Symmetry: D2
């Protein structure tokens, strides 16, 4: 890898997880964002989306709590109503433009409907396309599922996820883009927080091994794993402390120090849950990597809520955004005392 | 895998390598065919290709020496000058329509220009599109290289190859399409035939393992490997006896009997050489699988040559096709005495 | 591997599974044989064992149904009461002396009591020791267990078994000894004959892959797998035909033609069950390898029974031996009609 | 793994690499020590070794620079001339008793004389035997070699190494014994330091992966790798700065933070060089793990030299020990200024 691009990779990767800042994931596809909009009964118009992405990226002050924003293709190339290109709104607040570059989840034949992530085809060309658009980091999401009964996640699922992410990451780096390796394991099921730690540890082990095999520069890469948590169905009352501990443990057991940081994913956690947990993790003293956030839902839920599509509520909702952005910023320093919303 | 599709895959896989028949590869992309045409100084027009494909698939009597013909997308959906759909010319002569599903070779980042075969994005839908259009089996080509000095093929190559193929092969089988797993090792370089056997043995072992890992029904699939030959620069005069022995050996050492047959590839072998070799192979007593051919160049060279585009030479050319196509048919039984051309 | 030793390996491996002959496993350790003896209330004296091994190996005519006898260390070096060395009794009846060379099963730390096989330490020296004693083939037994609920056999179990056998086999060959690779999967449990086929296929896949990695000459090796059968607890009434089919399928799906033969293991099957099943397997037409037996209990049960330790019953029991030896010999040709005992 | 043993392993692992202390390797086998003694023309008698070990473990004040000392079986159970048990000399100076558990290197069949470390047979029982005798941690040494031309280290080596270590490491941990995973890559050959980094990175990656696969509690174990240096024939004058950088890099790229520390090995480095290098390493700011030493030769050379066996030189020699032992202690803090000998 050219010493220049390499140096670039390392720089942005490190800038992406600088002290007190996380990444806002506003990369919802036209489909998923529809889901988000439906909750506030908003019409999934191109105008509505543009107004939304403009609401987030235009929030004056967002640059202190956000290091980078993961953008969806559309948004990466669009402008708001007043002709201001979205990436410029980011630049205004010193936020780094990012771009989701995977073409979605499909099933693996001969597995009980376990996902595979499309995107490798043409990815290299797209990367350049995006860099020119002003993007500096990319994201590719995979989905693993725990089901002790049905033996999930199977080795094929794990191997597939390992190799895919690896291939993808090796490509982005070639094209001056820092890869956010996202091997998400879904909390779905009655599995306990212990199983989650075990499965999460196994997966990450495989992941990094694949990264090694393909030659992914860890120093110019980021990991976006699921925090260790109980299954959605597990009645056993686990505490935020367990979450933090078990998570930090499994990470220390797998993630080499070369990796600049870990940008956590809220998954199905509530906005507060994510803030607290993230906090309880950093609360656990000095870690060898940054343990920040890459929150989307956990950062947008109330925003999208209080907005209701009605521009009359734009400012009001922009505050809500900073409210959550600051919570998670302090949570970075283990300084978030539950209060910025519930 | 549904008992119905399984049975079908098994059926066509076995039909595709029936006694005495091989596969005709006429799936040349617009670019590659251009190269072929350039030799006879023919213009790479749509009409010219149409006439050429038509010339091949029209050859009355072709069905006795040809089980199936690998078509390129275009040819799979086109007709000849007289409005006759190309697939129909095949049906006429009882030939099975095949389709090349790989979207091309690309480089693996962090390897000395080693390839990665594009395709998996969409492949499922495309497979359906093709099945409807009368495609029964598919093709995917991977390119490995031997370079002892530079340590090629690297594990990354061999790995990417294995997983790529297996990924494709499973998708195809899901969509009633028999997959021809093509792990081609370029005979380029001064490597000896002994090294070719070793490397090939390795490569195959890794491939079949990935096939297993992904759930590729061997009984409903086929393999198109290179024959065990010396390198293009190996001054060591090796015999066709050697080619036959080593090849049969490395195959017995790696291919499970559940695999219907091996459709050999000519590569850079002269039409006669490919025939001779394929004969030397089959000559080695009964084998657990069919050791047939899936030639393209070693079948078309003389035809395209004698044709010169001039329709005035159509039948003259077609004769040459049957000349070769029969040569190899006998080679199948080990009954080919070097004579059908040189 | 020296062409001479290699040639030797191939020869004995092929001689070991010649037409109509199987291998008698009389390699019970002082512990296990105690178990066998207890059933007839025999004292586990050295004299008793010697009388026993002498009863088997002395049976005039045993050389037609037995190609080789797997011996336990002791027996390999002992003589009978009249000073006749055991290996000489074998030579008399043209039976090839074999030797169990693994030091037993221990557990794998961090697995639910899954076995690991000791023996690698010093194995090479022992091999020579044994060859000098007149042994030509060796055996090393591993034990895998199916438990869908507890996810057994785990990958660690499978990987361990794969690598161990591999290491062992590569050593024996070096020392002029043909290795009988035995990856036994126990029928214990409520798993169905379908699961057994699936698990057995997975395991064999891994096994042969490891063999490849270590460089085990398949042509000078033998496999001793468990037949595909229902779990001991599975109430679902399976037929001998299913057993035969499913077994042959999984074998064709994994075992390369290079492997000279497969010497089946009776495990917990009754003497007849083993004869019938073995028969129903060969009944399934021409196979690419020998599918013979390596029966021990299935060959000794009635012998040890009718003998009762009382020499007055030696001849009577010797007949019983041939009775079973012939059953399984015909079963080799798919010619065993249930009758030689029940 | 029991919470009690887990805690213990974790404890001693962390104690074994406490600030400023390293490990003294005096586990030399009767044969290797003979070599050492031959240099000072001393007779390899039982008494001589006893006096030598006694000289080392008696050094009043040694405990400040030495956390633990790797003993050979003999020394672990012997006493000095005055009847004082060797382990007691250690306890006196608060040094932790360690034991080498590997039964020696052997060749891997079908590799150009690459090693395989014996031991696993019995290791469990022996571990108990040793724990009782006061052994708290253990040692196992694997030897890999770099030979770009002959493609060394082969995957078979790297694999066997990884699985061997992990197998041992898990057994030790079961029996309250902290395992020192020793993947030594011989600096032999003209390979550059860049290649050493690459190969080392690879090797470590594979090792930690096997450790994971086997369930080796990283927190209760330690690693003894080679430092990243150039080959014995590499005329390219590399600096200690380079050694320090590359080494720190390849480690950050492969070692999870859960691993307490890295106990470096001198190999063929001169006492001073090992000190300098180890200093250049620690000099590179704070690290997530302890980058201490586990020297043997680089600690004993001058001592054994100045001793000449003549007890008349005992104290004179002991001073030299503390001379070096302190050198490295400061090297630990990056405070060693080249002066304690040359």
């Amino acid at each position: 890898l050219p010493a220049d691009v390499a140096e670039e990779l390392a720089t942005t990767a490190q800038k992406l997880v600088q002290a007190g800042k996380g990444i806002l994931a506003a990369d919802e596809s036209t489909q998923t964002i529809k889901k988000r909009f439906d909750n506030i009964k908003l019409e999934n118009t191109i105008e509505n989306r543009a107004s939304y992405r403009d609401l987030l990226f235009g929030t004056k002050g967002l640059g202190k709590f956000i290091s980078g924003a993961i953008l969806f293709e559309e948004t990466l190339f669009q402008k708001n109503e007043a002709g201001v290109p979205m990436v410029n709104l980011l630049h205004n607040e010193n936020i780094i433009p990012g771009i989701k570059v995977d073409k979605g989840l499909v099933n693996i034949p001969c597995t009980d409907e376990e996902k595979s992530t499309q995107g490798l085809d043409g990815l290299a060309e797209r990367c350049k396309e995006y860099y020119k658009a002003g993007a500096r980091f990319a994201k590719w999401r995979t989905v693993l599922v725990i089901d002790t009964a049905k033996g999930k996640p199977t080795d094929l699922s794990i191997h597939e996820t390992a190799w895919g992410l690896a291939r993808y990451a090796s490509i982005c780096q070639q094209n001056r883009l820092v890869p956010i390796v996202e091997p998400e394991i879904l909390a779905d099921g009655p599995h306990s927080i212990e199983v989650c730690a075990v499965v999460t540890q196994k997966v990450l082990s495989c992941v990094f091994k694949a990264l090694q095999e393909n030659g992914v520069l860890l120093e110019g890469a980021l990991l976006k794993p699921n925090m260790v948590t109980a299954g959605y169905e597990c009645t056993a009352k686990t505490t935020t402390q367990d979450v933090g501990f078990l998570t930090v443990r499994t990470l220390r057991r797998t993630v080499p120090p070369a990796l600049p940081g870990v940008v956590f994913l809220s998954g199905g956690q509530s906005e507060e849950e994510a803030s607290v947990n993230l906090n309880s993790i950093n609360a656990l003293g000095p870690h060898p990597w940054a343990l920040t956030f890459s929150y989307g839902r956990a950062l947008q839920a109330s925003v999208l809520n209080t907005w209701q599509g009605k521009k009359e509520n734009v400012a009001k909702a922009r505050e809500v955004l900073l409210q959550r952005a600051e919570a998670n910023s302090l949570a970075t320093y283990g300084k978030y005392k539950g209060g910025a919303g519930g």
